RNA sequence: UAUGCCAGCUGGUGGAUUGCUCGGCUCAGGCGCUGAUGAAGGACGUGCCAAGCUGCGAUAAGCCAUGGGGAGCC
RNA sequence: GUGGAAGUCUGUUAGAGUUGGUGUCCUACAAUACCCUCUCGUGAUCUAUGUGUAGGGGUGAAAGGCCCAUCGAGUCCGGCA
RNA sequence: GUCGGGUGAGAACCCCGACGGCCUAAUGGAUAAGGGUUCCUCAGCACUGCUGAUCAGCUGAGGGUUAGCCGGUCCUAAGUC
RNA sequence: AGGGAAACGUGAUUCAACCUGGGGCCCAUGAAAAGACGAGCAUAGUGUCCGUACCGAGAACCGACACAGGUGUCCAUGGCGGCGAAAGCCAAGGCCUGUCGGGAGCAACCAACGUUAGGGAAUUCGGCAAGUUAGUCCCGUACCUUCGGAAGAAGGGAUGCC
RNA sequence: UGUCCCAACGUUGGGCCCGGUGAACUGUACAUUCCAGUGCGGAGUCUGGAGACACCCAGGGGGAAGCGAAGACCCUAUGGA
Ligand SMILES: [Cl-]
Ligand SMILES: [Cl-]
Ligand SMILES: [Mg+2]
Ligand SMILES: [Mg+2]
Ligand SMILES: [Mg+2]
Ligand SMILES: [Mg+2]
Ligand SMILES: [Mg+2]
Ligand SMILES: [Mg+2]
Ligand SMILES: [Mg+2]
Ligand SMILES: [Mg+2]
Ligand SMILES: [Mg+2]
Ligand SMILES: [Mg+2]
Ligand SMILES: [Mg+2]
Ligand SMILES: [Mg+2]
Ligand SMILES: [Mg+2]
Ligand SMILES: [Mg+2]
């Protein structure tokens with residue numbers, strides 16, 4: 001018996017890779033007689049032809065690691081491979097910081113805490129890179 | 144790069160094809176001229192005395 | 200029938216990436232000799248095969264306990280893991 | 282490649298010329314196809 | 328002058344089309360258009376052609392898959408020849 | 409007396425030889441243009457079964473007429 | 483601080499190239515191959531397809547290099563015995 | 564690759580299962596050129612296959628490619644006639 | 645509608661495709677034409693002709709071969725990893741056809757290659773071959789210089805897990 | 807730092823034996839040679855001696871001025887480019 005053709009049909013009827021199709025070893029004679037796609041579906045309904053399960057990589061160990069690192073661990077000098085600028089893009093970081101600082105100033109102005117002149121003065125200084133962070137800005141604001 | 148075998152790989156270009164006028168695979172589809180019968184170049188049929196020995 | 204311990208130290212003589220194959224041959228030759236039967240007549244149950252290939256083709260165990268039976272009209276042995 | 286209607290006709294003919302001398306012709310002639318052409322070993326025209 | 332229809336194309340596949348889709352298959356002259364095939368077929372078998380699909384075959388001939396109307400029955404039209 | 413040398417015998421391999429000639433080579437006499445009324449050439453078709461060659465051209469190894477020929481032919 | 487220039491750097495990203503091993507091969511896997519090493523890799527960059535230039539003529543960041551395994555004058559047939 | 568098993572006159576290499584492996588810009592998926600029937604089915608082993616073969620891109624015979632809305636077709640490019 | 649054995653989800657982040665903006669460069673200025681829009685709606689009829697199989701490559705292409713060579717495009721967003729389209733490992737998918745096997749602890753010799761005490765270039769035309777170093781962070785960095793560079797100069801320290 | 811002193815052990819693929827497949831190079835003849843001599847002055851074959859029972863396996867290549875190529879060097883030709 002030669003069931004290679006049936007393997008190709010079964011793969012397509014089951015809509016699976018040929019390598020995952022299973023043919024009951026005790027029914028080679030019957031599968032051998034399977035000539036049509038309908039003959040195949042029939043054997044499929046009899047469980048004579050089945051599809052093995054596809055595996056997926058476990059992300060369990062990945063998640064544990066992800067947790068340690070989210071908590072700040074496993075990132076010492078001995079764990080880094082890329083250059084500092086590679087681990088954190090400095091331009092992207094500046095956009096983050098300067099936007100946070102501008103939004104802050106923006107809220108204090110509408111809120112009334114800052115006159116459009118103080119705001120202006122602080123805004124210009126922020127864009128000039130005078131503040132390391134929002135906190136740093138807030139601190140400077142309180143004289 | 145070797146001018147021999149390695150340079151033979153890029154040869155998938157069609158040039159000479161079956162000619163409408165004489166039937167020979169000599170109609171150069173790029174030039175639209177048959178190198179065998181002259182179709183595309185001459186109304187008269189391509190032919191030369193050097194195609195045979197001088198006294199024949 | 201009886202339980203026998205087959206030594207596979209001689210599979211080390213074969214190149215390492217191919218022990219499993221050689222081991223499987225040693226097992227057949229051992230049963231053939233100790234049960235006075237032709238190597239053609241020794242049938243190894245897949246269990247034995249899987250045991251020898253458990254750690255891949257290069258890491259075969261040094262021994263393997265095998266249960267084998269002898270009988271029939273042409274003489275033979277049927278063997279399995281234990 | 283993209284074949285035209287005429288090219289298709291020619292290849293069809295070449296496939297047809299690629300058949301064997303019918304058995305009955307052997308008996309009728311009291312006893313080879315010299316134009317046998319394999320797709321791999323041989324090359325067609327055009 | 329050449330005729331449109333050459334002969335019925337009868338093969339396993341042509342049977343399935345006839346039995347399951349009410350279509351008839353013919354070998355026609357490769358110079359014939361779908362329209363010419365539709366007409367020729369109606370006038371020869373007294374039927375109503377609903378659709379014609381063509382193909383220039385690797386045999387050097389043209390094949391036409393002619394579907395008839397629900398009013399006509401391919402199985403019967405083909406049985407008389 | 410292995411491996412083996414020389415000559416022969418039986419069988420083979422090979423295709424020489426001799427015989428044979430449906431092909432060539434050369435000489436001689438006769439004759440001599442075809443095509444837009446689409447030639448020559450080529451392509452693709454055409455047979456009950458048809459791959460090659462020949463013939464033929466969707467009327468496709470052929471259709472018609474007259475003469476010859478003759479009981480066979482495809 | 484921002485910005486992100488460059489015939490700029492590192493880089494077997496892709497891709498291009500071809501220094502050493504004078505290794506393997508050398509009736510080859512191959513009439514120019516295999517492996518390791520090595521150079522370039524935003525530019526005068528690499529590449530597909532189409533297209534142009536023809537033989538004392540082309541083309542040449544020039545080596546007499548290249549113009550279909552053919553080049554200090556291609557190939558084919560003829561002159562030609 | 565191995566152990567069982569299937570078919571067969573014949574099985575190390577044709578097929579099934581298990582176990583063990585190989586490939587991750589490819590040894591996967593879709594295609595251009597180019598090939599031209601190599602595609603599918605059935606029947607086979609004189610030929611081809613770096614061994615064998617019940618297998619096959621091999622041998623023989625049949626079958627298979629369906630479009631208003633995918634391409635061509637149309638436009639114009641370098642340029643060609 | 646369909647599909648699924650079944651459930652036949654809701655939110656989020658980073659976001660290829662796709663859309664839409666701002667800036668910079670040129671002794672370089674980055675096609676054309678057909679066509680579409682401009683220019684409504686109903687109903688009906690028509691929409692012919694050619695291509696379509698398959699391979700697309702360590703056996704379907706070129707290389708005389710089932711040739712370790714050559715041969716364009718798209719998939720560049722599968723998981724872990726890490727700077728990464730890198731390595732290594734693993735999915736999906738593919739394969740066991742880079743297609744001859746069986747046997748000998750399997751000697752000499754050869755191809756690739758591992759490890760070699762003490763010495764450490766004595767080898768050699770020559771350190772050829774091989775080896776050493778190496779990722780990242782901190783410290784620190786000479787001569788010279790066209791002030792750009794030299795520079796990762798050199799040298800020193802750190803590096804895991806919980 | 808196995809480049810060297812100075813080599814060793816090991817790993818994988820061969821090599822060796824077995825089944826199957828199955829070429830090529832090369833061949834005036836003879837041929838078990840060795841030491842000397844001789845000879846157109848570079849001899850398995852001539853001369854004198856010596857040695858020499860036949861066949862077969864594996865080896866590293868001393869000889870056959872080994873195989874491969876009508877010498878590129880040099881000269882000559884009332885040669886070529
Ligand atoms: Cl298309
Ligand atoms: Cl903006
Ligand atoms: Mg910056
Ligand atoms: Mg050349
Ligand atoms: Mg056929
Ligand atoms: Mg169509
Ligand atoms: Mg650069
Ligand atoms: Mg680089
Ligand atoms: Mg070009
Ligand atoms: Mg010079
Ligand atoms: Mg097939
Ligand atoms: Mg079969
Ligand atoms: Mg298709
Ligand atoms: Mg192969
Ligand atoms: Mg040492
Ligand atoms: Mg020295």
Ligand SMILES: [Mg+2]
Pocket residue numbers: none
């Ligand atoms: Mg010295």
Ligand SMILES: [Mg+2]
Pocket residue numbers: none
């Ligand atoms: Mg070196």
Ligand SMILES: [Mg+2]
Pocket residue numbers: none
């Ligand atoms: Mg003597």
Ligand SMILES: [Mg+2]
Pocket residue numbers: 876877
């Ligand atoms: Mg000479």
Ligand SMILES: [Mg+2]
Pocket residue numbers: none
């Ligand atoms: Mg000279």
Ligand SMILES: [Mg+2]
Pocket residue numbers: 887
């Ligand atoms: Mg001269």
Ligand code: NA
Pocket residue numbers: 320321322323324325598
């Ligand atoms: Na071909």
Ligand code: NA
Pocket residue numbers: 333334354388
């Ligand atoms: Na027909």
Ligand code: NA
Pocket residue numbers: 439440
């Ligand atoms: Na005449």
Ligand code: NA
Pocket residue numbers: 458
């Ligand atoms: Na015929």
Ligand code: NA
Pocket residue numbers: none
């Ligand atoms: Na600045």
Ligand code: NA
Pocket residue numbers: 500
């Ligand atoms: Na190289």
Ligand code: NA
Pocket residue numbers: 537538555
């Ligand atoms: Na010339």
Ligand code: NA
Pocket residue numbers: 562
């Ligand atoms: Na000549």
Ligand code: NA
Pocket residue numbers: 576743
């Ligand atoms: Na095989």
Ligand code: NA
Pocket residue numbers: none
């Ligand atoms: Na990733």
